[PDB]
Structure formats: structure tokens, C-alpha cells
Amino acid sequence: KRTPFIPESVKNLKKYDPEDPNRRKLARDIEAENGGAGVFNVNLKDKYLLEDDEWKNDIM
RNA sequence: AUGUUACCGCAAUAGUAAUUGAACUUAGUACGAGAGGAACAGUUCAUUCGGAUAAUUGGUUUUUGCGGCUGU
To answer: What is the DSSP letter of A48?
Structure first.
């Protein structure tokens, strides 16, 4: 037995509207705030899940 | 050389001031019926020039530093 696996959070997500005053922010949306294409800097430490958010700032 | 000496300086003046390209994005938009297709900005490397440099890479002279070879 095998099934196609689509989680309920996928179906429960609203479709992104490209012309919308009230919508989800994309990466370009946060990107265009401080500078533009090349000069924007990616943050990885903020996003990933940990048991403590202070451990996001901590250093391996 | 202008008493000497020493340091810190100023500047009359002399010369000197980097070449060329493409990678994102601005863009698949302005534009164009389409075909297709920008650029100012903002980032990234390359070529060439100039000046330095030995951390490393590599070459090179003086090694006669260590170990070893081949004799006459």
C-alpha cells in the first residue's frame, strides 16, 4: 500500500496572491526593504528551530 | 658651504595618478503585434598596468644542513 503524501498544512495554506495589499511577505519583500538584490544579506541563524532561541545566537 | 648640533616639521617646486571585459539584479520588465529585449543605479569577478609581499604555491642563487650513492 502506498499513498501520495500531502500534509494538511499544505492544503491549509492560502494561495499566494501576486497583486495583494494584504499578503504574505516573500524573500524579495524583506530583501527590498534594506537595499536591493546583491547588497541584501541572508540570515540563517534566525530561522532554524532549536530548543532555545538564545541557542540560535550561540556558537558551535 | 653657509657658529655648531640634534630632532620634529612646513612647503617654493618637480613628477604622479589604473586599462579592458562580463556575472547577478534593475529583467524577461520599459519597449515591440511578436520576434525578442535595454540602460542609470546596487552588488561580483576577470584582463592589463602600477606598487608592494613571503603566510602559503612554485621557481631560483649562495647552502656544502641531515642521510645516501658511484668511483677514479
So the answer is: S
- For cell 537595499, the residue is A35
Distance of A39 CA from B17 C1′ (whole Å)? 30
Q: Measuring CA to CA, how many Å separate A44 from each of A9, A41, A47?
A: 23, 10, 6
Residue with cell 556558537: A59
Cell of residue A3, nine digits? 499513498
| Model resolution, angstroms | 3.7
Experimental approach taken: cryo-EM
Residues in chain A: 60
**Cβ-7 Å neighbors of strand B:** A 35-39
Query: Cell for A42?
Result: 541572508
